[PDB]
Amino acid sequence: RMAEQQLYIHGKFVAATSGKTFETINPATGEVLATVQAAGREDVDRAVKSAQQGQKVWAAMSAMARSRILRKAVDILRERNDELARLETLDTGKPLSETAAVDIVTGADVLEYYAGLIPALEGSQIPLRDSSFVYTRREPLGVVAGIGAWNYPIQIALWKSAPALAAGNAMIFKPSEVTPLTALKLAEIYREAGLPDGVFNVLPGIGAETGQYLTEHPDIAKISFTGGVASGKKVMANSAASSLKEVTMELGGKSPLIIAEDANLDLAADIAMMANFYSSGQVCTNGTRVFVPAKFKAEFEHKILERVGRIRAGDLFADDTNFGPLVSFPHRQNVLRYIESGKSEGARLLCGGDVLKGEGFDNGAWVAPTVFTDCTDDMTIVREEIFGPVMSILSYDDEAEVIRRANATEYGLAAGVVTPDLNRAHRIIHQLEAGICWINSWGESPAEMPVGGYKHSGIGRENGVMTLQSYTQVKSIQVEMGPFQSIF
Amino acid sequence: RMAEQQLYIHGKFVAATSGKTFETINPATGEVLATVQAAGREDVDRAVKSAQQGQKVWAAMSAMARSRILRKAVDILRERNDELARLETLDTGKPLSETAAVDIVTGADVLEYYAGLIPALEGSQIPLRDSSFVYTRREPLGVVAGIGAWNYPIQIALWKSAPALAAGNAMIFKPSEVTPLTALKLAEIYREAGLPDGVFNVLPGIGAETGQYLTEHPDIAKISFTGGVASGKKVMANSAASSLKEVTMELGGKSPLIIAEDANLDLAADIAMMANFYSSGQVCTNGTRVFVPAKFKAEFEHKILERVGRIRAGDLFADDTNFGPLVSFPHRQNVLRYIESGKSEGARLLCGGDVLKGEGFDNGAWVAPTVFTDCTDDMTIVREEIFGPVMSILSYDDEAEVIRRANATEYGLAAGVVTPDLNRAHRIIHQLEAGICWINSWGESPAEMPVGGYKHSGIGRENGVMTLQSYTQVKSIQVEMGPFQSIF
Amino acid sequence: RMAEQQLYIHGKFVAATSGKTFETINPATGEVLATVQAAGREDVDRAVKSAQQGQKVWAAMSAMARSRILRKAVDILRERNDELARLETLDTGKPLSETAAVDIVTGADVLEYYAGLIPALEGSQIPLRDSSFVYTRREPLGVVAGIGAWNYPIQIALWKSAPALAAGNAMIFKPSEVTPLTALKLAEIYREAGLPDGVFNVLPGIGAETGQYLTEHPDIAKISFTGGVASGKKVMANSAASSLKEVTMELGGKSPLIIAEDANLDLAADIAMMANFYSSGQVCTNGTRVFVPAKFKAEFEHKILERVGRIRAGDLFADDTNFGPLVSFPHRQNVLRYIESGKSEGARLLCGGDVLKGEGFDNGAWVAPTVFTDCTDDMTIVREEIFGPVMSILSYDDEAEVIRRANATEYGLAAGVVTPDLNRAHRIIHQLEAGICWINSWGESPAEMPVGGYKHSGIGRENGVMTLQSYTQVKSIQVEMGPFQSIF
Amino acid sequence: AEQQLYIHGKFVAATSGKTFETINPATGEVLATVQAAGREDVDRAVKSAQQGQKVWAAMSAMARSRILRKAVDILRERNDELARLETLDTGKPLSETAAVDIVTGADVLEYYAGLIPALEGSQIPLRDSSFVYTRREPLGVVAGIGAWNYPIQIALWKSAPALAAGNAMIFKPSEVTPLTALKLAEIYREAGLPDGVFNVLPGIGAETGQYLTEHPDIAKISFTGGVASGKKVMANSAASSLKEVTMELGGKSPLIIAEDANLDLAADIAMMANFYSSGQVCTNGTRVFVPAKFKAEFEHKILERVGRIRAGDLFADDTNFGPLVSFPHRQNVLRYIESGKSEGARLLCGGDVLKGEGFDNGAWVAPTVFTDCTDDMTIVREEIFGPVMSILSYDDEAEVIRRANATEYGLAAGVVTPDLNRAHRIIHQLEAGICWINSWGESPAEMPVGGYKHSGIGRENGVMTLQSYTQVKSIQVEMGPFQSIF
Ligand SMILES: Nc1ncnc2c1ncn2[C@@H]1O[C@H](COP(=O)(O)OP(=O)(O)O)[C@@H](O)[C@H]1O
Ligand SMILES: Nc1ncnc2c1ncn2[C@@H]1O[C@H](COP(=O)(O)OP(=O)(O)O)[C@@H](O)[C@H]1O
Ligand SMILES: Nc1ncnc2c1ncn2[C@@H]1O[C@H](COP(=O)(O)OP(=O)(O)O)[C@@H](O)[C@H]1O
Ligand code: NA
Ligand code: NA
Ligand code: NA
Ligand code: NA
């Protein structure tokens, strides 16, 4: 068990004045990992006032001075990769084989990426006439808030804080109450790297209280939220009701994976496995509707069954463990309800479908990797995001049909196609209504690549150059050197 | 009085199925200009289905084919400028000297600007490694909705529809119920130019009903709103509770005009006049807080008095008329209540402060050009947007003070400084919290120049290259040519 | 017989003062099309003085004013497409089936493209610190010179003049002595569209005199040259010895077409035909080294021979004529010299290889469509650009080999691959050392697509947004608002 | 010790059998003997660079970024050591070399290191069945030819964008100042730069430079130097393989002092624009245009400033003026100074060599100011590249603009004025690529710099220079049926 975790405001840990606390559990064992202080409404005001003061210092530094500080944080993150991954595994239940290879690596990658782009953030100049011209500034928004999710805690904290800080802002970050521990470590790392006090403050708390106080605060200029659709709608309402904030949202999806008729089915099965069962299915971009040609459906089902048998649940710190428990018992209950709806609605259970039992599993919220086939577009498991290890296999006959069915959804996050054919790959992908599209692969999210959802799967984007710009606001300045003429 | 005006859906006028109608008044005479049908919830669904069909045709065309069609619309607008300006004057009360020289000219300027940029709308390509690369597409959002305000009806309709159409979308536009007529004329012009049926539909109606049905519709991907702060929060709230849509908002302001001690007071008075009394002060960007050095206040007040004396109210179609009535009689009542609040809080009335009377004025929603001086930051007339011909003059002593007071507001739309000093002009402008900044001028809004508000004055921008891109959504596509590795 | 053609300087035709003239021949008949005056040194000086005056007027106009004038020129070009194409056919010998569908259509496409981009030509702004910032202007170079080639006379004149004029420069254009007529017509069209006098001047003449005088003139800021390698070096030499001009060159190539082992051979044959025999083989981008897998070569040869037999030479104004004579009789002698070296070096003649004879051909500079096979990389017809209708078919065994051989050349203009395989298409293309690469096609050159040569095939690029910027020069301006500190 | 060539990550003996010497301009003594690269050495460097470039280009963008940033960290740590070597070779005071030469060199390397991941191509849809995408590909092997006034800074300003874009660079330093370029090559290797990616070939421009410009496998030349040498480079590159050339040449930059200017500010700007690095700077504002109504006051003010100049031991902290780069160069500066007298200019100060203990053995020229200067004097029309300020009087704004512009040079320019309109209005009409308002000499990594007209071709620094070390490849994917007309 760890020492009680405090708030991080203005370069130091500090006690909350709310008087309230909460606990974070190890989902593998059910044991209390740490007691955590919850930030109250006055704590948020203190953090904002800290952030405002830090932001002015940060923005007044040179671009390269900011770049050097963020790269020092990158170097610290590279050195502590394994220790941070272990803490992440304890807090989330994700296997160390994942956390040590993805979470901090790809979080630091994005921070490293934006650190180098700070000097390239430029405005524009526009000649109007000999006697007048316009120039623009890309100015910081000021103080922004990020609200994190629990499936990739430190990666989300880095993907939100890196462009915000690179753009000259201070960020107040509220991690998920399920997974607050790595965000506090990151705040320490930033200060050790030289980040001015107040530029990155962390306020653990519950969404109903700490999250709401951030969305309502009048001096916060932007909210960036990753999480479930329900928590997103409230954030948008209290953010609409309160001061007019720019909001960015990354929500879930029901992303289609389209297997072409010319595709190698070993590759298709491998992609489908990686698109559904990584992080035990708790990934917004997962390809949970797998469309397979009728002529290859039976063979593909066998290949999935063979691969599902290879999934190795067990000690989360063991090298060969590649499957973990779900993050909490309530989350598993929702996944189990979807599985039962699949059975009742006439889907064919190909494997899995039950909790795991026995020594090492009875204390965690384990669900067996689950695959449904003979699925139809009207089934609940096909239409709604489950956020668990549940693959739906759907049959199709022709390309126009599968494009129509892949797009027939309010979700819009990701999509993919498996095919060796040049024309088929680009032709199909160009017609899919999704922001993130993979050809003959799944899941890779380079720092250079803007990612985000179409339709109901999000607002705005993360990563890429455009996200650095989206954490600035444009000021247009006209210099009139001619004599001004009034008609009055 | 005109024949009952209908909805415009899919290239033709069509009767509303709501059974509801409303009226628009000539604010110069009190007469009913026309009865206008109101779009019901089923009419909105019809418009969306029409827009979905038209958008597919429009996006399938070549970039230059879309450019040629929009440039044809520009040519029609130039030819019909005078006819359109007269209808705008009848509907808004703005003098023909304004509508014939600004409203359509600058609206058509923006459409002409975007028509030429369509072929330069490009994605990106990013090499990851020899065996994989990413490319992006800037895809249409699909169907978007624009909600217009009443002060610049046809200019707003063009500033919203031009980037939306240039980016490959269809727009459903809801004009303000106070001024619905010119938007319906615009729809016929677009069709005459060759715009495919459905790409620009106009649905007159009320904000509470028609506006809400648009903000609620699940198949509209973006809302662009121009209006008051109050209605904007509802739009964002209703849009939040409903389908998760991209939002752009251009709201009001309380923009400061900072007269420096080295300013020519004749130039400063001319700028102050144009920033307050054009369009009878019904302009979101107006510089309604005029900061003048104490040492110059009395002389500046005299120069202002001279310019108010030159204002020529009268028949809106006369060439010499440069001041009109307010857009409606209810709006005049709101402006009068602000004027009474100024007297009751002790602001000194320098001129105006009453309705205009006599033949040709007693029937119009006229307010005299009004100037309050000896104004203080806590007064209601200084804190709240009036949207009428009411200038507030505030004394200041030093630069740091005027920057703090200029910035001490929830509004953030525009700002300006009058000074011949190089350092003072840029130094002040860089510290002001506003998106639109004029040095030694006011009011010019080139098509190339992004415009929009800080803080509560808006979300996003209009005009400039960035606004064309903001009407597309980014799709990132990874081509993996190497062997895919599954960990399962 | 046409009237004697004069120089076009400052908006009017004017007599040369050289005392020298030349004749242009109709290559289908041998007859003199027209006598054309040649510009001497004083004529070039006169053109520069005219250009300097006109450039100032042109650049002082608004961006949109320039845009509208160029679009008016586009409209005239569309209206006169057939008339201009017939003149081009008379001067060049290319079939009307080409000239009326390509030459002016794609020339006007580029002018239309750049006309719309003028308002998006923008500088940048870079904040250094609170007290200092930088902004940049993209200023016109001034007077630039274009030197055209004879194979696409009016297209080259448009591709060079469109970005130069759109960037605010004046251009002096020197057409090839072989094909001077359409350039003089283009000058008349620009004037009729409203181009200020002097902004586009045309000086027919010979390269050794008129061309050299332009490349040597101290007041020309940039040279753009399309032509053969030998003439380019002369241009580059005279430009270096003289005032320090920026040079751009589009020279020839020996571009490879790589047919993959999985390619459909009918598609491969159609692409190879279009890559070799359009415009009678007189195209810099032609795919004159056709690489075919050994196991498919015999079948590919059969398909080529069946298509070559469909080629229809004849009256250049007949709808079904798709093959024309070469541009001149001296050029035919060079092509015949290359054909004889192919025979003498042991390449196997598969078809053609001789002049065409009989009624209608005896007076034209006709060469039969010629195909060699069993070619090796050391043969002269494989190593050197012929600029005639001569295809070389080379066999290969594996992908690494064909890439090495495709790249083993000093030329670098174009390349292509025929394959339905996604990985193969991108993987091969990424390794080819050429600026213009076509997958499963040949020859399309969209206005948006930058085109130019690697290695010895060119310097710089044409088309695309980057070419508009390359006709401006950057001025960086630092505004220092802080106190300057001297160490002395 | 006999300095050698640097090829493929090690020092190697030249195969020319030729050598040259570099002199310490403060003492006249030989600093070092340096081997000169011959034609076989150039072919060696190119062949090594071709092999190294593929390894370098095959790495990830961030892998290249990290290596270049490691070089930055080494340069910072070795700033003082490198600065001292620069002082010995160039004669610039340590107060300059330790504060500018490596600092601003590393700044550009650091800047470009961060931009590598943002180097992107484009994608253009043509129709549903076809689209285009572009790659920004390395040119391959490029060559840089450096000047002697800022040896290591030029090496960094040329090599940083070239390497960041994925190329290998062969750098030929000036024979006057070859030493710091060889240290940089060592630093790059220590940082992990693949062997061959940065090769250094000291030599003479008549030989070594020509062999680079003539080599058929070099895709681009970037040259900084004098106009005459540049024209020879461009000729030899013309006669040879078709290379993209970039040139940063000299200038006769005008410094325009307005009627509302503070003359204390103007005099400080004029001092830094003329006498930094002993006036051997291409961007120096050697023509100082001053209003007649103020000339006398500005002159007094110039004499006051010139009096604080502290020549002396180049390693002393308070020294701010050094000798010229070579005694032969000193003669040319003195030849121009004598022409001002012969042409009638009034000598306000300087104009001779410096004498006495510590100066008789150095290549010192006194800080020189002429006034009563006219637009026709040689010293006003031609670049001297020494500590010689020319003061010129003017009467109206149009005159000073036309006179400022009445030159074939186009490198830099400046205006001193507190008035908003005058600064922008004047600067927008001046024909120069580098314009300073109320300052002089600052050259941020973000800011493109280069000459109008005869003062240069192309630009250095800024994002645009990273792109200019790439070449665009356009790729059309045609997914529709291809139609032949035959
Ligand atoms: N009303 C709210 N306002 C702000 N943040 C909230 C709100 N409700 C939840 N959150 C926060 O949003 C993030 C993601 O919540 P999520 O996991 O999607 O929902 P839930 O906890 O209801 O399953 C967490 O940080 C959570 O505390
Ligand atoms: N709740 C709403 N939802 C959508 N549109 C609305 C709403 N309220 C007002 N609008 C519309 O917004 C535009 C600007 O409204 P505004 O003048 O600020 O409010 P109102 O017209 O209600 O006084 C008009 O077209 C108006 O009808
Ligand atoms: N003809 C030439 N070809 C190539 N490089 C040359 C040539 N002449 C001089 N250089 C080189 O150009 C750089 C700058 O030369 P610069 O000082 O302008 O000329 P100079 O040699 O007359 O002093 C040095 O590296 C020099 O050796
Ligand atoms: Na936990
Ligand atoms: Na009305
Ligand atoms: Na001819
Ligand atoms: Na030396």
Side-chain angles (χ1 to χ4, degrees), chain C residues 129 135 139 233 245 277 310 426 429-430 432 435 437-439 444 450 454 461 474-476 478 488, chain D residues 127 133 137 240 275 308 320 424 427-428 430 433 435-437 442 448 452 459 472-474 476 486:
Chain C
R129 46 189 180 274
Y135 68 100
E139 297 189 341
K233 294 188 177 290
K245 298 177 179 56
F277 300 124
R310 294 181 322 158
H426 298 289
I429 278 303
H430 291 183
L432 300 182
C437 291
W438 289 295
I439 296 173
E444 182 172 0
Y454 283 29
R461 294 289 182 273
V474 178
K475 170 187 286 171
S476 292
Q478 179 189 10
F488 299 111
Chain D
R127 48 187 176 275
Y133 69 99
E137 296 197 343
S240 74
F275 297 124
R308 301 182 298 262
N320 58 20
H424 299 290
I427 285 300
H428 293 176
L430 299 180
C435 293
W436 291 293
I437 297 168
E442 184 173 356
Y452 282 30
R459 294 294 183 268
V472 171
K473 175 188 279 169
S474 291
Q476 183 192 13
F486 298 116

Side-chain angles (χ1 to χ4, degrees), chain A residues 68 71 112 116-117 120 423 481, chain D residues 66 69 110 114 118 421 479:
Chain A
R68 292 162 187 156
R71 299 185 310 208
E112 197 173 16
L117 300 189
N423 288 352
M481 299 178 279
Chain D
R66 290 160 186 161
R69 299 193 310 260
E110 189 168 28
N421 291 353
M479 306 177 281

